[PDB]
Point group: D2
Chain length 345, copies 4
């Protein structure tokens, strides 16, 4: 390569738009990254609300450090972070606080055209969307395809929680055995786009309208359909859907697939274990969803759930991987942000 990455001693200043579940957890992880520092947060509320929500967290625990509210922001372990309440990305003066890269984590500007509103005079230089960002934006799952970045990009995508879970599992199947086709079901924690109790859903979804913590709720997901953005050779081969269920975080992805090469359960499991790294984990323990809350793997393969069914010479393969849709995704997002910040030019 010729990427001439900055050292982690060269601290890149970052902005967060949307201090929500992903925004706040990203902020937490950035405290333990040497070369990245958050100097500006933009949301729709006062500093006290945001400071309180950083300090206390229902699913991810108390903040590791001190948080203290101040005029126009709050201090985190002594260091001041500016807070603003600007509804339009175009009006945020990111350059005032030295911000080069924005984490776009509101859920309202997840496209090239909308995210580009952050890039203007007195604005930011680059934007990382914390969600799928359309087919014209480079979409990175860290340790699967982050080598597609050269640092000249203005808008990139960190993909979805489900994509970060599925990608290394699907890639391992492809590289070892060849994937012909497959169908995915993710059994997913409820999220902030569902209603706490039955009521009109602003996006017109009749199922997200329903009480999220009291129902099994079917819903759509693009993670299988858009896997070609991450793994080109799987383009058009996967499709899927979700069943959202009453846990506040923690999810699992099942993939049923046909393969080119013949396999046994043992060979499938061995292939996953050999593909394991900081992003893709491996376990043979019979765990449940609470055991993956707060993990740093993007995807945790569960060898206890593997199936290989051969009937009349035709085989279906089932592979299953866990993910904390909050912290698993956030860990991948911050790995990508850190890498992008180093090569940004």
């Amino acid at each position: 390569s010729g990427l001439v990455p900055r050292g982690s001693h060269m601290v890149v200043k970052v902005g967060i738009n949307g201090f929500g579940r992903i925004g706040r957890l990203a902020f937490r992880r950035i405290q333990n990254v040497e070369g990245v520092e958050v100097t500006r947060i933009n949301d729709l509320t006062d500093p006290n609300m945001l400071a309180h929500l950083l300090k206390y967290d229902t699913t991810q625990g108390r903040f590791d450090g001190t948080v203290e509210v101040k005029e126009g922001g709050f201090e985190v372990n002594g260091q001041f972070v500016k807070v603003s309440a600007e509804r339009e990305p175009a009006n945020i003066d990111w350059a005032t606080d030295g911000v080069e890269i924005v984490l776009e984590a509101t859920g309202f500007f997840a496209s090239k055209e909308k995210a580009e509103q952050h890039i203007h005079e007195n604005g930011a230089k680059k934007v990382v969307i914390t969600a799928p960002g359309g087919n014209d934006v480079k979409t990175v799952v860290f340790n699967t395809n982050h080598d597609i970045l050269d640092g000249t990009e203005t808008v990139i995508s960190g993909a979805s929680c489900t994509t970060n879970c599925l990608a290394p599992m699907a890639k391992a199947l492809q590289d070892n055995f060849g994937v012909k086709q497959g169908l995915m079901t993710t059994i997913h924690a409820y999220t902030g786009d569902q209603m706490i109790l039955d009521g009109p859903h602003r996006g017109g979804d009749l199922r997200r309208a329903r009480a999220g913590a009291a129902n099994i709720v079917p819903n759509s997901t693009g993670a299988a359909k858009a896997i070609g953005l991450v793994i080109p050779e799987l383009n058009g081969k996967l499709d899927g859907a979700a069943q959202r269920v009453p846990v506040p975080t923690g999810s699992v992805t099942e993939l049923v697939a046909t393969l080119e090469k013949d396999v046994t359960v043992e060979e499938v499991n061995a292939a996953m274990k050999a593909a394991a790294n900081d992003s893709y984990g491996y376990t043979e323990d019979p765990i449940v969803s609470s055991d993956i809350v707060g993990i740093s793997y993007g995807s945790l393969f569960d060898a206890t759930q593997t199936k290989v069914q051969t009937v009349d010479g035709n085989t279906l393969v089932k592979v299953v991987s866990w993910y904390d849709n909050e912290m698993s995704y956030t860990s991948q997002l911050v790995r990508t942000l850190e890498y992008f910040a180093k090569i940004a030019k």
Copy 2:
């Protein structure tokens, strides 16, 4: 047959619609919310806590049919711009949660508008606040805006009134252990009202919060003005609540006398039970308040007594039943 409109087809609005189906002399001809007819029709048909709709619902142009009868749906954000009179609407159920004052609710009353408004919530001290079968006799029919009180007030009032009439209340403190509601966040996030506790995941926490029901009880029971205060603990059930009152009394009492007084005060609004029930057993009940004799305490220490009385309520259907009883009576006069 008085024609009614519903502003805010939410939990209270939809359940009020359901109950109005079995009340002759009241009929809903117009619904106003912020969404399309297909969304509202689906939410009427299917209900997580209150069950499937008893009847047929079918989406049409600009509304939906309920058992063959068309109801118009509009999506007007401002009360002033709703043409209620077009559909014959005299009385409006103001059930959005955003216009719970005399000035704001009066916006429904204009040319091509409505005549009267019932606020499905506390509406201030200058609006008559009615708990049915406790103080609905204060209505004369000339009022423009009235309040149906809160869910907690409809629970508390008959229980507090029975203690006052029989034994006299000196003072008391109330705790309501309450179902989570739509004003809490599904997961931890910024609360638009500035509440740091309603900001938290409502179905995953015991969440302390404020309530005005005990402090404002004087609007319903004048003789208890200034005598009660309280608070709430919101907990992970999607509907169904309970109110505890700890009080000092003028007269000496026993557990049996307290329970007997409640039984004697029982009616369509105020129920009585000695069964050891739990919250799921009161989901969908028609009582505004269900006294539970199994939870009564009378503690006497060194001549001084504290009395504990407890009543169940479905914050949804118990309140809605009361609301529709008041609507029916108000429309008649």
Copy 3:
């Protein structure tokens, strides 16, 4: 009028009793469990997920009255020691979960005992396994012990049969997203069956677990023997479940053709819907299985196709409705 005995007045036993109140030719005259009549009467009257009993229940000496009719209650731990014949009982619903085999269920059949038994669960390969309206024609009336199968089998069977009859099934894999059940721990603790996942808090986790419904489908639909396998993900709802099947077929299909085949297969046991429902909408239904056309997929890649079909079931009431249909039919022949 055939007289029925219930062993194990649990979730299935109590709901079977409830359904039998609306079946004219059948009557429960004896209940056996491990507790006193007051506990059982209370648990009949009040039900967290299925609502208040539609009737009166009053505790008496050695049992309870349901709408004035006495039902005898015993607490006999061993099936061989229950004197079923005393109360005219000919057929026993074996619903404890502890006697789900031919040899164990046969203990009910003795002198002063019952004549026949229906196990409310899988009961082994030497017991006829019946899903009503899929294979109840295998019964001739001479059987002593039969099986009503599982909840998942009653969901999966009509959906799989419809695929087979119309298109021909080659193979398939099943996932059921299932309500937690009484065999899971309320909080993390030692599981008596040795299951490390059922040991975990059932209402606070997604819990993978095994199921035999797909593997044993050959007992119900012979032509699908050895063709299906599956597993479960148990999740935090107290009742209500859904079965997804991904399959390969002999004929080429479209989404529209698959949905049309299910609609044509629909009967009292197998329902059809195009409404975008969620799990609470199927609690208390009478269908054994409710096909959801909104979740169908037909994926064709390089000439090869996978088909996904999904059906809802209330693991409690859907199963119980099938069980009582089979019980009635088995009693009449």
Copy 4:
């Protein structure tokens, strides 16, 4: 370094084990339950509400290794038959819930048995009942069987003691809004103890139930004997609870005086906060009781005052922290 045994490797037993890993003078060499080592090792490693175990756990013949150190596991149903002395065990944490009395807990003490027992629950009126940093001074070290009280008692005691010492309590009523526990049914079914409310689905209901914490407060704070009574509302959180006390006092007070008195009473056992927290924020805390100044009320009507004071507790880890403090102290002076 005193060697300890655990009878009942349940919620309290397992969390007690976890805390003992960070106590220098105490060490667990024997666990007794009703299951195989693989089940117990798995339940130690993975915990729904309290998180993954900080350390390595590996199953072996007849037990498991924790960071390379072997701990013996047995499955003896009767306390009389457990040979505690074989593994050097002097003090036993009795955490099954089935032997919470002097007579039943004494069964552990025999030849080849243990010397002393700490019951992780109320143990009756004839056993010394200790809330650490409230009345652990009543121990002299000669006792055979002691009690660590209940979760609610450990919450209530320092709050009630602070009111008594500063202002004087006449009487009071307590409501604890409590997490569901292992003695409730997961779904509606026959309750073996005959309780018609604990028979109901614990994670789907508000469930009224009895508690003895207020009535038996005299065992911990003698001067409050016969002055308090209460009850519980069990609700759908898997751990985390809160205790409300409404009381009449001898002295007149303000909200500020009441809060200041609690802050002055604060220590490792009794915490103080002014932050508007919720139950998830107290899961895993080491305070036995955490006073919440945001919920205090002082209502005066016609010269007569009622005072409301509220404290949080993680019925699991708050109680366990107090239990291990008392165990450590009791072992030191034995």
